[PDB]
Amino acid sequence: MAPHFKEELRNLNVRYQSNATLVCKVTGHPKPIVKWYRQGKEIIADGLKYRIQEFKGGYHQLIIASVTDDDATVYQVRATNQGGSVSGTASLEVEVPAKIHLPKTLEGMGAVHALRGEVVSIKIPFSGKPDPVITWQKGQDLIDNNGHYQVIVTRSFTSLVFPNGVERKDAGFYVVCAKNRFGIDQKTVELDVAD
């Protein structure tokens, strides 16, 4: 009997830093040998990031520890005997709730100290999967790109920039917010401007 997946690999949605477990059940005679792959590159069990467990009745399990977005990909499992070889595939998607990560806080909030005319960037790392929506406000007036401010949003941070150089009036309290479907998080940064 050529190998068969009696129970196929399942797609997984797993929360960041948890362990992800991929399981399948394999039939075949002679008993198939199972290899595991991350996007087409063989995974070698090392006992730490990757562990393999096999049980009676043809069950085969891979445990991927402490899952990062790096682990969020397509996985293959292959079963092979002298009668044939077949693979199954599943995806792992890693849910990270939206979150703002202030490098430095003073008295509760972020703080940026600037001199007049300095081209300031308020740079704010964040997390979230799905990628979150980002907004900035000053107190409570939304900011988009106009003639005064520029917003940068990349995969991992957002920056509020004062491309024309800060003016004394730029002093105040800026609120940055990251939102996805696993949640919302906001933080405030105080800017002060020195002359």
Q: Is residue 70 at the binding interface for Cl ion, with CB under 5 A as the rule?
A: no
Q: Is residue 56 at the binding interface for Cl ion, with CB under 5 A as the rule?
A: no
Cα–Cα dist 169/159, whole Å: 19
Quick one: how far is CA 21 from the chain centroid?
18
Q: Which is nearer to Cl ion, 146 or 154 (CB)?
A: 154
Of 4-12, 38-46, 122-130, 165-173, the segment contacting Cl ion by CB under 5 A is: 165-173
Instruction: In the chain, count H helices and then E strands.
Output: 0, 17
Q: Are 28 and 2 in contact (CB under 8 A)?
A: yes
Q: Which is nearer to Cl ion, 106 or 152 (CB)?
A: 152
Q: Which is nearer to Cl ion, 77 or 120 (CB)?
A: 120
* Among residues 168, 172, 181, 186, the one that binds Cl ion under rule CB under 5 A: 168
Among the listed residues 24, 168, 152, 18, the one whose alpha carbon sits nearest the alpha carbon of residue 87: 24
Name the minimum Å distance from CB 88 to Cl ion.
33
